[PDB]
Design a protein around this ligand. Structure first.
Ligand SMILES: Nc1ncnc2c1ncn2[C@@H]1O[C@H](COP(=O)(O)OP(=O)(O)OP(O)(O)=S)[C@@H](O)[C@H]1O
Ligand SMILES: [Mg+2]
Lengths: 436, 71
């Protein structure tokens, strides 16, 4: 359940290649050297996967087929999904209707798999290159399935702004004291208008008791009183003595204290909430291992099983530290991989990456000439195993070893007349095509 | 939900353990749609993006206040 494919103006595919069915399983492709086979799969992930996203001029031009210029503006690709491009951000002509990039960004994840499956393809002679590939690179391989370090980049990055923020926190912190201070001043300055109104009533009643207390007696001279006498100065002596008049001290202090409280609750909050993000992290930095050291299991546990297919002659295990492959090809004597035959290594490769590919199995997979250097024994073991794997997923391979053929489902050849390259579909005489 | 993602204001810690739930926090692994860990990453990011933007706003305030007193 892939659907149709045809091109217009893409790489060596000059004009039109309306030369394609076809259905699920084991579809195989070939043709001459640099006829455009690999260009063709380029065609493929071209659309399916965001490997062709941002990069500008000489990158973006390249793709369009630069064959003496011509219509440099027209480079269209059909899968079912059309993606034309012209000179300068002439984007997706998305599935007859017409949508966006960000749109099937969502759709492939809800398919899927996505952009997200990094083993969804497999060239390059890479497989090779991975013989080459050493201990640490293996770790990577694993991580990059569970996405892991794309994660790790973020972590560190957040963790910076995190402990970057937290210097504003201190700049902040300074300002609060500086506030606390401005209310420490606005405190004394209310203590007063307190103590003050205290007096000009406290006084102003003595004033009124004695207006009576001593006119009381002149009421009666018609046929604590000393204490109060000089006490009524010990008051007047101070309102006149100490008054920086301000009628607002208990208004202006009411609000401007409230805020300080409002703030120093926010201010406080932060710390609390810091200690919780900062706590969140460790909750996750754990989860990362959980995510990995779990996949690891699944991967090893696939691997042997897979390997033991290809080479039922011996067994293979994974060890980890920071990752190794322990190995023997025939039960006889074992050990580490960095000792094996060019080819001998090359087996694992595959196995491994199958082992991996198949732990988050996607709907679809392709394989540029995955068979380019392993020799005989194995080729049989592989093509078969792959075909067995075909059942559940869509597979597409290039080859030039015929050994995937004596076993294959569909069949395609690519032809290059000097400016155009074409795919043509043949069967048995296709298998004859190579043997020539 | 949604509240989380793009990464104006909300509550930090109230979410830092809404994530822990998507992991193993009170020890019942594992439910929901879990942690694409891609997701975890870009979230965490966001939280802090805001956690920061808060402390900033805060400071902006204190100051805009403190000077408003000087009046
Ligand atoms: N956009 C393009 N426009 C014009 N020519 C191109 C374009 N892209 C690639 N080519 C040419 O086509 C060749 C690439 O063809 P490929 O797909 O690599 O052949 P192939 O299928 O890889 O065959 P092998 O086995 O890898 S040699 C290059 O060497 C270029 O000369
Ligand atoms: Mg190639």
């Amino acid at each position: 359940y892939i659907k149709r494919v045809i091109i217009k103006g893409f790489k060596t595919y000059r004009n039109e290649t309306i030369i394609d069915n076809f259905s699920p399983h084991q579809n195989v492709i070939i043709g001459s050297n640099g006829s455009g086979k690999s260009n063709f799969f380029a065609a493929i992930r071209f659309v399916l996967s965001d490997d062709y996203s941002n990069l500008k001029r000489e990158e973006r031009q390249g793709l369009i087929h630069q064959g003496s210029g011509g219509s440099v503006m027209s480079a269209s690709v059909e899968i079912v999904i059309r993606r034309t491009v012209g000179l300068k951000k002439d984007d997706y002509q998305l599935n007859d209707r017409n949508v966006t990039k960000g749109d099937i960004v969502r759709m492939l994840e809800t398919a899927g798999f996505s952009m997200n499956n990094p083993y969804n393809i497999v060239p390059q002679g890479k497989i090779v290159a991975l013989t080459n590939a050493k201990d640490k690179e293996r770790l990577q391989l694993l991580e990059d399935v569970v996405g892991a370090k794309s994660f790790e980049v973020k972590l560190k990055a957040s963790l910076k702004k995190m402990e970057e923020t937290e210097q504003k926190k201190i700049q902040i912190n300074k300002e609060m004291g500086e506030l606390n201070s401005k209310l420490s001043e606005m405190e004394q300055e209310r203590k007063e208008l307190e103590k003050y109104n205290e007096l000009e009533r406290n006084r102003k009643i003595y004033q009124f008791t004695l207006y009576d207390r001593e006119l009381n007696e002149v009421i009666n001279q018609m046929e604590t009183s000393d204490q109060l006498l000089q006490r009524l100065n010990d008051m007047n002596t101070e309102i006149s003595g100490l008054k920086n008049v301000n009628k607002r001290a208990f208004e202006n202090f009411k609000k401007f204290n409230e805020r300080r409280k409002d703030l120093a609750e926010r201010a406080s909050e932060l710390d609390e909430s810091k200690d919780s993000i900062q706590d969140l992290i460790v909750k996750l930095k754990q989860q990362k291992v959980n995510a990995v050291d779990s996949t690891f299991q699944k991967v090893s546990e696939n691997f042997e099983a897979v390997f033991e297919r290809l080479v039922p002659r011996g067994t293979a295990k994974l060890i980890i530290h920071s990752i190794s492959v322990s190995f023997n090809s025939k039960q006889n004597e074992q050990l580490h991989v960095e000792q094996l035959s060019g080819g001998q290594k090359t087996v694992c490769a595959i196995a491994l990456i199958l082992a991996i590919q198949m732990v988050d199995p996607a709907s679809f997979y392709l394989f540029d000439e995955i068979d380019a250097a392993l020799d005989k024994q194995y080729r049989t073991a592989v093509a078969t195993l792959l075909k067995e794997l075909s059942k559940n997923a869509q597979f597409i391979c290039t080859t030039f070893r015929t050994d995937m053929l004596q076993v294959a489902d569909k069949f395609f050849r690519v032809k290059y007349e000097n400016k155009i390259s074409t795919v043509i579909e043949v069967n048995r005489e296709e298998a004859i095509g190579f043997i020539r | 939900w949604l509240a989380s993602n793009m990464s104006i204001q909300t509550h930090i810690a109230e979410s830092a353990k809404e994530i822990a739930k998507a992991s193993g926090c009170d020890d019942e692994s594992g439910d929901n749609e879990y942690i694409t860990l891609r997701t975890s990453g870009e979230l965490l990011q966001g939280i802090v993006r805001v956690y920061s933007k808060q402390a900033t706003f805060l400071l902006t305030d204190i100051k805009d206040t403190l000077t408003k007193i000087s009046m």
